[PDB]
Amino acid sequence: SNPYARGPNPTAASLEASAGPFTVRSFTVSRPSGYGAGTVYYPTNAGGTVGAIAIVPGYTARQSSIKWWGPRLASHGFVVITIDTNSTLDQPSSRSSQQMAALRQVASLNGTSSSPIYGKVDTARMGVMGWSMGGGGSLISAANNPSLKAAAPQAPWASSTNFSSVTVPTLIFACENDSIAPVNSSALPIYDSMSRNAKQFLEICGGSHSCANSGNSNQALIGKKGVAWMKRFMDNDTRYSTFACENPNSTRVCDFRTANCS
Known about the structure:
It is found in: Secreted. The protein has 7 helices and 9 strands, in the order αβββαβαβαββαβααβ. It has helices at about 10-15, 70-75, 90-110, 135-145, 185-195, 220-235, 240-245; strands at about 25-30, 35-45, 50-55, 80-85, 120-130, 150, 170-175, 200-205, 255-260. β5, α4 and β6 (about 150) form a beta-alpha-beta unit. The chain is globular and about 50 Å long.
């Protein structure tokens, strides 16, 4: 039996829905350590400790752009911290450092008896997400910290597209019409650089650079894929292998590629 499996057996409908099974609460981090601000979203009743995911916005952007992931992931059994960076103009390497500082603080709060997440986190199971330069920051985090169990950046951008060293399972959300981090020169070459991992590339038809952000019109599919990827790889939960690895056969998807993902 898998000690990390949480929640009921998934279906397409349950993963496309507004929320998973678990009640979600949130709090603002009172003294952020190593990053600008954070909001923690957590399940009150997951039935065991859960992994932690840290999510970072893009250049000029704030938690509002990424916030929708907090309740959506947490309701399926994850502690999620969304951050603001120390400056809105921080670059990807700085964003990676701050992302790991946010994961560190989640681990600190897991050990703080006054915190709402005291004892709720398995600090050995962590994941990284983020938009654009925060997505490039997530890939840097994975390259530098290969114990991370999953990465799922959106509309990523980094100074170099070469992430050949990454061994962390990585799902890339791409936005077809992105004019800031174009698919062809950003998301796709980042995807193609990775030869050592389970990986996936999922491009949303018609998407602008913000197509995976809060308020987007594809939360059913994008949320299904993000949760399935994190469940399969952070929880080793093979009930999610098909959802994580499948072509979703969706008219909202204009390009789908995956490797080392059965």
